[PDB]
Symmetry: D2
Subunit: 215 residues, 4 copies
Amino acid sequence: MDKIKQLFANNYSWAQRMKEENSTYFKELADHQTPHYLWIGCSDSRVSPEKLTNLEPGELFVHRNVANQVIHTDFNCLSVVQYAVDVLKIEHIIICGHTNCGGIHAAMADKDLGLINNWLLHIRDIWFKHGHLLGKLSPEKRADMLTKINVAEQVYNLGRTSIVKSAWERGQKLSLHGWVYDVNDGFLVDQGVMATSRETLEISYRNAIARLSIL
Amino acid sequence: QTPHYLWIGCSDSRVSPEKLTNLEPGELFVHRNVANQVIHTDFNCLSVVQYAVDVLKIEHIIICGHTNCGGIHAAMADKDLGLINNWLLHIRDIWFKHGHLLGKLSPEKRADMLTKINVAEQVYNLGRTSIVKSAWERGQKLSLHGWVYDVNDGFLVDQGVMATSRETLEISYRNAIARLSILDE
Amino acid sequence: QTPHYLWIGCSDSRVSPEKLTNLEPGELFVHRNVANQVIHTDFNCLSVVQYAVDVLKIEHIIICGHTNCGGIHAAMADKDLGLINNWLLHIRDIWFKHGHLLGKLSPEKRADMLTKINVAEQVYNLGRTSIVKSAWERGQKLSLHGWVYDVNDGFLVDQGVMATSRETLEISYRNAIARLSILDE
Amino acid sequence: MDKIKQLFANNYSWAQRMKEENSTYFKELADHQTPHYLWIGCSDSRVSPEKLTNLEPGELFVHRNVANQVIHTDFNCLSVVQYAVDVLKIEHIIICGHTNCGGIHAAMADKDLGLINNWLLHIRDIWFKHGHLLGKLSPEKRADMLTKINVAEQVYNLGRTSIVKSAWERGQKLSLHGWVYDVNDGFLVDQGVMATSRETLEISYRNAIARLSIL
Ligand SMILES: [Zn+2]
Ligand SMILES: [Zn+2]
Ligand SMILES: [Zn+2]
Ligand SMILES: [Zn+2]
């Protein structure tokens, strides 16, 4: 399908509209721009950080993957984190989850999808680790809960990386945030895990899970 | 869902696919990593590719690099930045692989060339994944693209790497390498 | 080739499968990594498992931990050793997962228990790989085992985790965890 | 098949034979034993480092994988290397390849084997990178050449890890070796890549490839 010739023209048009409306827009942006935020979010299509954040363009370093994971031994995301933290000196990392997430839904289904199964086993381990809380919930309320739990677990993993622990240890400023977005209701205000230290991580995480385990 | 494109780009901050392609909301299924890599053994990127192809039946995968890429500059620099260097080794391999062509070059043009070559190499890798191949093998419609966004002017540039089959992957991959290695402007 | 076992053990130096099992030469197809892990997303270990199962049709996979495992001690210690800590986080998860049982324990017994639990968890992971499951699904003969070699006396100890099907994996995994969490000696 | 009850009895028997023949054998071994070598070798079954090296027991830290790879972004092997080098202070790493290797043979075939395909693409990239040298060789001599090349490439990768480069930089003693074993002829004496530094790596590697590109 010839969606491609259309995509290019739209780029062209957009780039023209930006120049004519601000001549030095690309000059300003192309140069010496240092992001102060990292966004770890889902590859799903209605959860773009460009859409969800109000940040100045060039402020956001971005990684996206299926179900917004920080797997302890994932070279890809750990590299984004380490480059962001050690080299770019970013001081805030955001893990953003969302409702109606395909990854969460696929983690919860038993379809053999090959490779993606291996990746989602991490989510399934998280589902089993909160089996009680989820089991005593209504089948179709569960995806929403798992999403919320997942963010909290991934932030926990983030805060336990060698990279984050060291930064904190040597007194570099670094705060982690875990939010959850809903397509209709927007950002669920009762979510926010938030950490600036290992001690704060623990409290924020624990509290977050307790809060979620309310009836 | 039904987005129509998987966009594989760099994590670098000026280069938002949504903004840049200016499409309807929800068109883009997205992966971003440092220097837009597709690495044969990276569950992360591959899982995105597989979700895209087998679950969402996306028909277009775009790999888009960009000018002025910090990843590429780090890949070119002999300087220890830590864990990230091992990730960039794949690109540094590519640097040295085409070291004769890049050697010829005026040093301030080398980052632009390595950016271009890197896109073509990553598409060559995408195209060799079991994921992409099986989809071709069994008749699914699937095209791969390799472009470069220029941060100085907002413009996507085709690199003329495009594949709809294993055979056409070979053809255009070779062509692009030859084109870049031999020709001059 | 035709070895009959895949042995997945630790890289630690006293614990050579060949020496210890005292088998005919060429019986063992082998993977070793730090703390004998099977990680859902580790191409390295998984590729070994797949070669074993699909190419060589090996019928027995052994996961063998051992007493006195440096990996396990590092996993238990709150101390930054670098890159390796991220690898050991998987085990540290397990430590904290069974933290109540291990909490009860006399501190010089905790490494032995975590060693045991770790074997059972890793088998639970092996057993959940698409590789193992498809082989079961389609009728191939395949059994998984979880033992611990005791470096103090040279003796393999069964941990009673054994699976020949997804269903029997559940059964013995649960049993072993219950057995270890509840009972006392 | 009941190979398992047999395996246990053989362990038992072996352990008894060792005690009765040396009472304090296991005491001596179980304790405070620090390896001075790391062996990276193939999972294939007739290439055990216990068999191939004459080292004292407890001297060898061991990793084995399909086709003895050091992939730049492989968390598993990089962890073995980093633990060996930074924590255990090992001063020699050996990458051992071998002839009649299944990995090499599978890399060279076009069977879809699923996951293992992804892993072997690394080898296939190495096959293509020496396409000339291999192509002008006789089809059934090629596996043997690819094995030999592979060792040299993996040692090259090893020596370019952040881990090895740093060790060298801060002046820690560390030497890398690449050997190739043949089931009949034994260790091919013309192989030995050997490096104690980045400068030596380069020379040894380059020379090794040139040497191999002789007619
Ligand atoms: Zn999602
Ligand atoms: Zn970039
Ligand atoms: Zn161990
Ligand atoms: Zn082999």
